């Protein structure tokens, strides 16, 4: 049996996700349209920028994240943003297509769309693979949400200062996830391990993205196409 | 009778305008769509950003602008960009509507559209008035192009260094314009004066815009919506 405050953490985390996840993908009509040079860079730059603001809204509602000093909140967001975006994007990923179906027909990004945004297959191979791995875990909503919160509250990120306080939070998060799986997820004897390995894979994707982004942002004809928030979060300042 | 090199300057300037003015306004479908908060800020930010790249392409083809040191070319563009955009936008302005008709129906910006982009009527009044003034001058293509080149080559802008070299160019430009009007524009006895007064009005619009932009860019929820080139050109660096 799960605890009362353990249940409170799941309830507040699920709600945070519902407030920051638009199941209708309707704000996508407000981005710069897809094209198919780097034809898909503008639309996917706007996608990432949009998603960063959702990830900040989610983080602001994680219990206790708000109580960290503003520096630490920046250091965690600056380094985990891309990982939480890869994490939440599983919701729109489909094993049936091997693409991300975000509502309408023009907002379905398969693998060839994403190469036209300036990224090579040495990022997209590990990325698509990661998504079918995470999709095969058939995670409950409660687990998908907890995994994002635990990826955010990692002390071992560049620039964090209160390693101890952030570590408390993250451990409080994995107690809940271990209890939840063990008590509410039949056949999850190995699932929590499979999820921690997913965080490991995410770190590897972060590196690959950070390398390919560095190349994309040192040529101004491309960084031009990026948004100010994307430049800020992925900038090295 | 106009001179040979005078005619060469008009020919090369008209061509520069044709290479950097899309009479089909077709790249407007590639901007963030209009909405009607600051609903029109994204689309009009993308409009200005687009136009800045056209103004740079035009400048790069003004005879002798290319031969200025890279600093001076930046100082002229950073201060005159908005004036050349107000100047070229006369082409899409219509006395019949009092709006800017840029091809399709959603790219027709009347005065209420432009207030939803974070600007007050103390900029839009002098702006719309300016446009019907410039529109009533029925300028030849040759004159409209020369006026942009003369607004660009003004030495009295912040940060210019070779005041003498830039002043040579600008005077070479007004000799052509005075000769052209006097020789090819029937009933232009007063027209060149009316055009120099238009440059004066442009300086006043520049100030008003620079004041309202400063307010818009000190609040990050709005500067966020701007593009990197717009931040750079209108930034104070």
């Amino acid at each position: 049996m799960l605890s009362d405050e353990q249940m409170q953490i799941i309830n507040s985390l699920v709600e945070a996700h519902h407030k920051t996840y638009d199941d209708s993908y309707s704000d996508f009509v407000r981005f710069r349209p897809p094209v198919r040079r780097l034809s898909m860079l503008p639309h996917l730059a706007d996608l990432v920028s949009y998603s960063i603001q959702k990830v900040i809204g989610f983080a602001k509602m994680i219990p206790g994240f708000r109580d960290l000093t503003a520096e630490d909140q920046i250091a965690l967001l600056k380094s985990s943003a891309i990982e939480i975006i890869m994490l939440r994007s599983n919701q729109s990923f489909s094993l049936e297509d091997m693409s991300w179906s975000c509502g309408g027909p023009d907002f379905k990004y398969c693998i060839n769309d994403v190469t036209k945004a300036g990224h090579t297959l040495e990022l997209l191979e590990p990325l698509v693979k990661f998504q079918v791995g995470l999709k095969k875990l058939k995670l409950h909503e409660e687990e998908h949400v907890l995994l994002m919160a635990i990826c955010l509250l990692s002390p071992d990120r560049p620039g964090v200062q209160d390693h101890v306080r952030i570590e408390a939070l993250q451990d409080r998060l994995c107690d809940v996830l271990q209890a939840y799986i063990r008590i509410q997820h039949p056949g999850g004897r190995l699932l929590y391990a499979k999820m921690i390995q997913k965080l490991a894979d995410l770190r590897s994707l972060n590196e690959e993205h950070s390398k390919q982004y560095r190349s994309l942002s040192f040529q101004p004809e491309h960084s031009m196409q990026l948004t100010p928030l994307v430049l800020e979060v992925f900038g090295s300042e | 009778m106009l001179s040979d090199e005078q005619m060469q300057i008009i020919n090369s300037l008209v061509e520069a305008h044709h290479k950097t003015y899309d009479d089909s306004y077709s790249d407007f479908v590639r901007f963030r769509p209009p909405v009607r908060r600051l609903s029109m800020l994204p689309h009009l930010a993308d409009l200005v950003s687009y136009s800045i790249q056209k103004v740079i392409g035009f400048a790069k083809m003004i005879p002798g602008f290319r031969d200025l040191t890279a600093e001076d070319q930046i100082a002229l563009l950073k201060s005159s960009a908005i004036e050349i955009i107000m100047l070229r936008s006369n082409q899409s302005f219509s006395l019949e509507d009092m709006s800017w008709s840029c091809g399709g129906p959603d790219f027709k910006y009347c005065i209420n559209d432009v207030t939803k982009a974070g600007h007050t009527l103390e900029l839009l009044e002098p702006l719309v008035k300016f446009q019907v003034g410039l529109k009533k001058l029925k300028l030849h293509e040759e004159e409209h192009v020369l006026l942009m080149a003369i607004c660009l080559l003004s030495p009295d802008r912040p940060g210019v260094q070779d005041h003498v070299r830039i002043e040579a160019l600008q005077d070479r430009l007004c000799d052509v314009l005075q000769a052209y009007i006097r020789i090819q524009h029937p009933g232009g006895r007063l027209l060149y004066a009316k055009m120099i007064q238009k440059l004066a009005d442009l300086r006043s619009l520049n100030e008003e815009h620079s004041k309202q932009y400063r307010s818009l860019s000190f609040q990050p929820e709005h500067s966020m919506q701007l593009t990197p080139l717009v931040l750079e050109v209108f930034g104070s660096e």
Binding site: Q53, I56, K60, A70, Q73, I74, L77, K78, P228, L229, E232, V233, E237 | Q219, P220, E221, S223, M224
Partner: peptide, 10 residues
């Protein structure tokens, strides 16, 4: 340093 993030984080 980080103008936008500071805003978004209230």
């Amino acid at each position: 340093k980080h103008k936008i993030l500071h805003r978004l984080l209230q």
